[PDB]
């Protein structure tokens, strides 16, 4: 019951995600080295890397490049951390509640991310998010529709053409529902779709809390060389 166009869309997004996500984690050797705000330079380098991948991903979702430049920028700045948190589930493992990226030297757990200045009000819900998304056990297509739907939120600050944005989300979400209804015939379709948008709501709270702590981290690391230009454009600059 999945239309040919919904099947093509899912296919496009899976192609986009594979091109902009690198499960060999081979550029990690290039970031500044981890140290165990001692982990800020490495973790900052990582998010600045990752944001660029998110931008690569965006540009390949149909109808995003067709947006005006200011809309794209306001969409990226609203959801950039939320999409990094989603896509990071790929490297997350419940075997020790870490993000592990090719080797144990690039293995991040809740403690390493407090040596980058963050606090329990974000980290604890962060790892609970990671564990619970794992238990969702999403198919590759559900994963990538979620990252796209989280980007095409017409309610973000600064969005000028909200009608166009809602149309793309409409399309995105109709396709998600259809997939759930086909692929999971034994579950309540309403129940499955709700458990996924619920994650989108918890991504907004993770994002507000991250925003809050970043303000003070960046102010703290203002004279040091710790934050790279891209994070400053995305998250703020004091």
């Amino acid at each position: 019951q999945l239309l040919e166009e919904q099947e093509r869309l899912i296919a496009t997004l899976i192609e986009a995600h594979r091109k902009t996500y690198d499960a060999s984690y081979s550029d990690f050797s290039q970031f500044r080295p981890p140290k165990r705000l001692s982990m800020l330079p490495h973790l900052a380098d990582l998010v600045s890397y990752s944001i660029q991948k998110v931008i690569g991903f965006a540009k390949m979702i149909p109808g995003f490049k067709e947006l005006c430049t200011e809309d794209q920028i306001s969409l990226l700045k609203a959801s950039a951390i939320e999409i990094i948190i989603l896509r990071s589930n790929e490297s997350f493992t419940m075997e020790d509640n870490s993000w592990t990226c090719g080797s144990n030297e690039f293995k991040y757990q809740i403690g390493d991310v407090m040596q980058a200045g963050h606090k329990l009000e974000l980290l604890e819900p962060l790892v609970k998010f990671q564990v619970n998304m794992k238990k969702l056990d999403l198919h590759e297509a559900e994963h990538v529709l979620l990252m796209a739907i989280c980007l095409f939120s017409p309610d973000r600050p600064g969005v000028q053409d909200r009608c166009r944005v809602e149309e793309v989300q409409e399309h995105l979400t109709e396709t998600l529902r259809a997939y759930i209804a086909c692929r999971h015939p034994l579950s309540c379709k309403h129940m499955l779709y709700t458990k996924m948008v619920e994650k989108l709501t918890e991504l907004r709270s993770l994002n507000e809390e991250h925003s809050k702590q970043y303000l003070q981290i960046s102010q703290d690391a203002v004279n040091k060389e710790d934050l790279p230009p891209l994070l400053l454009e995305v998250f703020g600059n004091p």
């Binding site: 931008i55 540009k59 430049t69 794209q72 920028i73 230009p229 454009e233």
Partner: peptide
């Protein structure tokens, strides 16, 4: 402005 972000979008 947002120099780098602007250049990524091309």
């Amino acid at each position: 402005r947002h120099k780098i972000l602007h250049r990524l979008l091309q």
